[PDB]
């Protein structure tokens, strides 16, 4: 429950501002990269190179509290099991953008 506060920091997500929302995925890298060969769907931005994971994945939702303030960025850590949706690109075809989870 202090996870998001550490994680946002170790991953340089609180460098100049506090990243409001951020999602971390706890599956193997291999499983997450495999999503690129799963259900093809529209990205929020309108491109058509997003994919949704056939399976729910173990994830963690990091959202800043209403009271948080740089440099002491504060986060609510919510764990969840959800289908993720990533944009894939390049060779190897791998995720390059987290898009959403359902």
């Amino acid at each position: 429950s202090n996870y998001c506060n550490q994680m946002m920091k170790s991953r340089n997500l609180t460098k100049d501002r506090c990243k409001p929302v951020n999602t971390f995925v706890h599956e193997s890298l291999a499983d997450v990269q495999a999503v690129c060969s799963q259900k093809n769907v529209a990205c929020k931005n309108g491109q058509t190179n997003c994919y949704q994971s056939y399976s729910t994945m173990s994830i963690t939702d990091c959202r800043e509290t209403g009271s948080s303030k740089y440099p002491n960025c504060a986060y609510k850590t919510t764990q969840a099991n959800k289908h993720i949706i990533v944009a894939c690109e390049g060779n190897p075809y791998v995720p390059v953008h987290f898009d959403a989870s359902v």
């Binding site: 994680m7 991953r11 340089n12 999602t23 995925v25 890298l29 963690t60 690109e89």
Partner: peptide, 15 residues
């Protein structure tokens, strides 16, 4: 400048 794939791991991967 960090390959977009690296960025995604730094940002969303905690295996």
């Amino acid at each position: 400048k960090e390959t977009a794939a690296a960025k995604f791991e730094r940002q969303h991967m905690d295996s």
